[PDB]
Amino acid sequence: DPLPFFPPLYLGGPEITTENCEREPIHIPGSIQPHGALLTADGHSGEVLQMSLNAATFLGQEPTVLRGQTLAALLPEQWPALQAALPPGCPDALQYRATLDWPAAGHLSLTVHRVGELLILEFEPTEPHALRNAMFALESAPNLRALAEVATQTVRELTGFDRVMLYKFAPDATGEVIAEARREGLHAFLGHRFPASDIPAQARALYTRHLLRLTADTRAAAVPLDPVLNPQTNAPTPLGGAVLRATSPMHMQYLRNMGVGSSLSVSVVVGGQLWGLIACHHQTPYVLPPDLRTTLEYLGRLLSLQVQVKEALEH
C-alpha cells in the first residue's frame, strides 16, 4: 500500500523498520557522506546558509568565516557562470559542474544545482578513447543480451568494481540480474530475481529523475548539515539531487550484510520509466572520482537509447 512520507528522524519521525519501508523520506536525511562537503546558498543574494560539519576541512576555512561571506566573494569566477547556467525556476535535475583550484585542498570538483530559491554546492576532490570505443561497440551489439554483456564488461573495465550487474525491472517492480561481470571467486547473481520491496517505491521514483547515486563506504557515519533545517523555510533541505546525500541506513545495513563496502548504480530510463539499473559492488570502500563518474553517466544515456533500439528489434 502506498502511503505518504514520515517526517525525518530529526523532526521526531519514527525509526524505519521492515514494516514502514516505503515511507522513509530518503530525500531529506539532513546529512551527507564524508568524502565531500556541501554548502547551501540563497539563490539571489548568494548568502551561505547551511554547510556540512566537515566543510572547514575541505575548504580550509572556519565556519563563521564561510557563513559570513556571499558566493560572489567566495567564488568570484564561478558565481556569474552559476547564475547564467541555473536560472530561477529551472528544474532541480539540471546540474552545472566546474573544476576549482583551491589553495588548501588541491583540485576540487564543484557540482551545483538549484532547488527553488536554494543553490546546493557539492565539493569533492578530483584527479583515453575508451568511451568512444565503447560507444561504437554498444551500438554494434547484435541483440539485447550481447548489449547487456558488453555494457557490464565495459563498466567493470573502466571502474575496477568487483561486480557490475545489469538489473532489470519487471512490470511488478521485481528485478532480475540479466547480465553481470564479476571478479574471480565471487558467486554469480545472474538469473536470480529479487522482490519488489528490495528497492521501495519512493526510491524508484527518485531514480527516474536523478540518475546516479552511490555509497562510497557502507560503514561511514553521515555528516550533518549545520544548521539541519534550511533557515529560509525552517524546513528540511531537499537533497534528492545531491550525490553526496547520505544513504538510507536500511539500505546500508542491507549492503553490509552482503559484504559490500561500496555501491554505485546508474539508472536506465526508457519511455519515461525506470527500465533497469547499472548496479556496481566493491568489497572494500571505494571512491570513484567525479570525472570517471561522468563517463558512467554518459553510458547510462547511451544504454537507454540502445535498449530502446534493441527492444524495437523484437516484437
Ligand X SMILES: *C/C=C1/C(=C/c2[nH]c(/C=C3[NH+]=C(/C=C4\NC(=O)C(C=C)=C4C)C(C)=C\3CCC(=O)O)c(CCC(=O)O)c2C)NC(=O)[C@H]1C
Binding positions for ligand X, rule: CB under 6 A: 18, 21, 24, 26, 175, 177, 189, 194, 197-200, 203, 213, 247-248, 250-251, 254, 263-265, 277, 279
Query: CB of residue 21 vs ligand X: minimum separation in angstroms?
Result: 3
Query: CB of residue 103 vs a copy of itself: minimum separation in angstroms?
Result: 19
Query: CB of residue 291 vs a copy of itself: minimum separation in angstroms?
Result: 9
Of the listed pieces 18-26, 155-163, 171-179, 299-307, which binds a copy of itself according to CB under 8 A? 299-307
| Residue 128 contacts a copy of itself per CB under 8 A | yes
21 is in an annotated binding site: yes
Of the listed pieces 27-35, 66-74, 123-131, 212-220, which binds a copy of itself according to CB under 8 A? 123-131
Q: How many residues bind a copy of itself (CB under 8 A)?
A: 32
Task: Choose which of 127, 132, 187, 314 interacts with a copy of itself (CB under 8 A).
Answer: 132
CB nearer ligand X, residue 70 or residue 295: 295
Q: Mark residues 26-65: x for contact with a copy of itself by CB under 8 A, - for none.
A: ----------------------------------------
| Residue 212 contacts a copy of itself per CB under 8 A | no
3-state secondary structure the chain: CCCCCCCCHHHCCCCCCCCCHHHCCCCCCCEECCCCEEEEEECCCCEEEEEECCHHHHHCCCHHHHHCCEHHHHCCCCHHHHHHHCCCCCCCCCCEEEEEEECCCEEEEEEEEEECCEEEEEEEECCCCHHHHHHHHHHHCCCHHHHHHHHHHHHHHHHCCCEEEEEEECCCCCEEEEEEEECCCCCCCCCCEECHHHCCHHHHHHCCCCCEEEECCCCCCCEEEECCEECCCCEECCCCCCCCECCCHHHHHHHHHCCCCEEEEEEEEECCEEEEEEEEEECCCCCCCHHHHHHHHHHHHHHHHHHHHHHHCCC
Which residues here bind a copy of itself, judged by CB under 8 A? Answer: 85, 90-91, 93-99, 128-129, 131-133, 135-137, 139-140, 271-272, 294, 297-298, 301-302, 304-305, 308-309, 312
